[PDB]
Curated annotation (Swiss-Prot), chain A:
Compartments in which it is found: Mitochondrion; Mitochondrion inner membrane
Additional note from the record: Present with 12900 molecules/cell in log phase SD medium.
UniProt record similarity statement: Belongs to the eukaryotic ATPase B chain family.
Species of the source: Saccharomyces cerevisiae (strain ATCC 204508 / S288c) (Baker's yeast)
Superkingdom to which the source organism belongs: Eukaryota
The protein's name in its UniProt record: ATP synthase subunit 4, mitochondrial
Coiled coil location: none
Swiss-Prot record, chain B:
Compartment(s): Mitochondrion; Mitochondrion inner membrane
Domain of life: Eukaryota
Annotated TM spans: none
Subunit details: F-type ATPases have 2 components, CF(1) - the catalytic core - and CF(0) - the membrane proton channel. In yeast, the dimeric form of ATP synthase consists of 17 polypeptides: alpha, beta, gamma, delta, epsilon, 4 (B), 5 (OSCP), 6 (A), 8, 9 (C), d, E (Tim11), f, g, h, i/j and k.
Function: Mitochondrial membrane ATP synthase (F(1)F(0) ATP synthase or Complex V) produces ATP from ADP in the presence of a proton gradient across the membrane which is generated by electron transport complexes of the respiratory chain. F-type ATPases consist of two structural domains, F(1) - containing the extramembraneous catalytic core and F(0) - containing the membrane proton channel, linked together by a central stalk and a peripheral stalk. During catalysis, ATP synthesis in the catalytic domain of F(1) is coupled via a rotary mechanism of the central stalk subunits to proton translocation.
Source organism (scientific name): Saccharomyces cerevisiae (strain ATCC 204508 / S288c)
Keyword Mitochondrion listed: yes
Miscellaneous information on this protein: Present with 6140 molecules/cell in log phase SD medium.
Gene Ontology terms describing biological process: cristae formation; mitochondrial proton-transporting ATP synthase complex assembly; proton motive force-driven ATP synthesis; proton transmembrane transport
Broad class of where this protein is predominantly found: mitochondrion
Shown residues within the full chain: 33 to 94 of 124
GO cellular component terms given for this protein: mitochondrial inner membrane; mitochondrion; proton-transporting ATP synthase complex
Protein name according to UniProt: ATP synthase subunit H, mitochondrial
Amino acid sequence: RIDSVSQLQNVAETTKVLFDVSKETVELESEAFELKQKVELAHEAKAVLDSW
Amino acid sequence: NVIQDLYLRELKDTKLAPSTLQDAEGNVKPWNPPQKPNLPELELQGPEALKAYTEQNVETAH
């Protein structure tokens, strides 16, 4: 029974860490969207400029 | 001699051939702007999801 209990003890603290970490990561991707629109604008501009 | 004759004739009688910037525009891709700045939708906003999740998965860790 002690063996069963021990696995769960270590989990209880560390899982709270991942829970936070995952949501923290999701925030970073929001900011990545801002980059994506920047990437697009440049590409379009370069293409027209190439045509010119 | 002939060099001079050609040089003179060529340069003088037409330097450049006609060109128009307006005509160029049709044949090249025009700049067009990206549509929407966009804002990401508020993902899993509020405890509506949480209350649902706690109930939905009350699943223990074995």
